[PDB]
Structures are given as structure tokens and as C-alpha cells.
Design an enzyme around this catalytic site. Structure first.
Site, short mmCIF file in Angstrom:
data_model
loop_
_atom_site.label_atom_id
_atom_site.label_comp_id
_atom_site.label_asym_id
_atom_site.label_seq_id
_atom_site.Cartn_x
_atom_site.Cartn_y
_atom_site.Cartn_z
N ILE A 15 44.54 59.98 53.50
CA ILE A 15 45.79 59.21 53.71
C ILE A 15 47.08 60.04 53.55
CG2 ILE A 15 45.02 56.86 53.40
CD1 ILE A 15 45.63 57.32 50.31
N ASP A 123 38.74 18.45 27.69
CA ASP A 123 37.72 18.73 26.71
C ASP A 123 38.07 20.02 25.96
OD1 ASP A 123 35.31 18.50 25.27
OD2 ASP A 123 34.03 18.73 27.04
#
Ligand SMILES: O=S(=O)(c1ccccc1)c1cc(Nc2cc(-c3ccccc3)[nH]n2)nc(N[C@H]2CC[C@H](O)CC2)c1
Length: 244
Positions: A15, A123
Site C-alpha cells: 500500500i 433481570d
């Protein structure tokens, strides 16, 4: 400190280049530890998407879904030392107060975030919290889809909300500072309903400061509009921890 095995690496393409060499895109095959939860219908793959947008450092993260195989499963962040109740309990006698406060804080941070997103846990209790790297505590099982942790409006008129999660968080706090003891340990369901209805609250644990006890009782007001919101609890818990 972190040496990588070449075999896990795959150069895909270059790259750019620095001055000591060049740079590449590649892949890295990691081997992440995960918790796999084996198992309605396919409407649940939408369920798994609302769960997946819920990202916070104190909520157990949902990595994805598996449906090719039989055993239809969810894939979750793996949490080192498992559930906070069992943890508090097998390690009883070895906690500093400060540590117990910090676990409560972790929960509260995660919960403040659920509150903000308008997710009602429903819960919350220490058996639904997991301990990770360095005793970090994460809230779990907010995904889905009892009296010891219920607000009056929840056993009475089944009205759930973040204010009702605040009641569970008060109970959770009691669980933490009492190092994993079971609340209303001998009482029956009606006895709890009756005692809480008559104004009885869980006693102050020795390891909890009177101040921390005040916040617990504040989480246990009778009327939810009277309880503080996670956002406020969080600023109060964070303050106590930062000072000393
Ligand atoms: O400490 S452990 O005994 C352990 C096991 C092997 C190697 C090292 C430690 C242990 C870790 C976790 N970690 C978990 C669980 C989840 C996890 C589970 C469901 C959804 C998301 C994460 N994430 N990480 N869960 C356990 N049981 C769990 C069994 C189910 C119950 O709900 C909680 C305790 C037990």
C-alpha cells in the site's frame, strides 16, 4: 511482549513505502476466545442487530450469529472469570471496599448506557454480570428474551423501566458489598412482598459505608419517580471512588 507467528499472517498487497521498507495490507487470523450460546425464528437475526449496536466497554459484546450449523448460536465476548455472584462468593474475605465500590461503578456505567439507549434490562442481578480482565465487570443478558430483585411496581403491576432496574441495582450493590450473600435469604415470596410493602429494607453490609448504604436505600424508594436515574447514580458512585 506480543510476538506474532508468521503463519497467522497473510500479505495481501503493498500500500506504500516508508524509508526502512514498504507497507502492506494483510490479514491476521487471530483466535479470539468466545462464549457460544446455543439455542423463536429468524426474526431473532434482527434481535441480534439491536444487540450489536449496543456497544460499551461495560456491556458484554455480541460478536455475531451462527445459523448454517444446527445448534443455532450467538457468539459473545469471552469473560475470563465468569459470573460475579460466584466470583464474589468464592473469593469471600479477600476484597477491599474500594474494589467492591469499583465493581458497582462498572455495572452502573453499563446500566447508564442501557438507560440512555432506552433498553430495560429487566433481570439485573449479580448472577447476570461477568468478571473479565482485572476484575472489570460487564453487564450481560440484556439481550434475551425473581422477587428478590423486583421493585414493588414489578411484583404488583408488572411495570418495568430503568427506575425498576435501579431497584435491582440497589439489590446488586447489596450483593456486592455483602460479598455474594443471598438477599432476603430465608424469606418466602409473599414475606418479601409483605416486608417490602411495610418499609423493611435489606440490612447494611459491614463492608459498605453508611454513605453507600444511603445510595442503596435511595435505589429502594417505593415509588420509581422517587429513585435516582443511572446517570445520577453514576456521577455519585464515580465521585466517591475518585475522592478519599
Ligand atoms: O471462569 S469460567 O469458569 C472459565 C471457564 C473456562 C476457562 C476460564 C474460565 C467461566 C467463564 C465464563 N465466561 C463467560 C460467559 C459468557 C457469556 C455467556 C452468555 C452471554 C455472553 C457471555 N461470557 N464469558 N462463563 C462461565 N460460565 C457462564 C455460563 C452461562 C451463564 O450465563 C454465566 C456463566 C464460566
Amino acid at each position: 511482549g506480543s510476538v506474532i507467528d508468521p503463519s497467522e499472517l497473510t500479505f495481501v498487497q503493498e500500500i506504500g513505502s516508508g524509508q526502512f521498507g514498504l507497507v502492506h495490507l494483510g490479514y491476521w487470523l487471530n483466535k479470539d476466545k468466545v462464549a457460544i450460546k446455543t439455542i423463536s425464528e429468524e426474526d431473532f437475526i434482527e434481535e441480534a442487530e439491536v444487540m450489536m449496536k449496543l456497544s460499551h466497554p461495560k456491556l458484554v459484546q455480541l460478536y455475531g450469529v451462527c445459523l448454517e450449523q444446527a445448534p443455532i448460536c450467538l457468539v459473545f465476548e469471552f469473560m475470563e472469570h465468569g459470573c460475579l455472584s460466584d466470583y464474589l462468593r468464592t473469593q469471600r474475605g479477600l476484597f477491599a471496599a474500594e474494589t467492591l465500590l469499583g465493581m458497582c461503578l462498572d455495572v452502573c456505567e453499563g446500566m447508564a448506557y442501557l438507560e440512555e439507549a432506552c433498553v430495560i434490562h429487566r433481570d439485573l442481578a449479580a448472577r447476570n454480570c461477568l468478571v473479565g480482565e482485572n476484575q472489570v465487570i460487564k453487564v450481560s443478558d440484556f439481550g434475551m428474551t425473581p422477587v428478590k430483585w423486583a421493585s414493588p411496581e414489578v411484583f404488583s403491576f408488572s411495570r418495568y423501566s430503568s427506575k425498576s432496574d435501579v431497584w435491582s441495582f440497589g439489590v446488586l450493590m447489596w450483593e456486592v458489598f455483602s460479598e455474594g450473600k443471598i438477599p432476603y435469604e430465608n424469606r418466602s415470596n409473599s414475606e418479601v412482598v409483605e416486608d417490602i410493602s411495610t418499609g423493611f429494607r435489606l440490612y447494611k453490609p459491614r463492608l459498605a459505608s453508611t454513605h453507600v448504604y444511603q445510595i442503596m436505600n435511595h435505589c429502594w424508594k417505593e415509588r420509581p419517580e422517587d429513585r435516582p436515574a443511572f446517570s445520577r447514580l453514576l456521577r455519585q458512585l464515580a465521585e466517591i471512588a475518585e475522592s478519599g
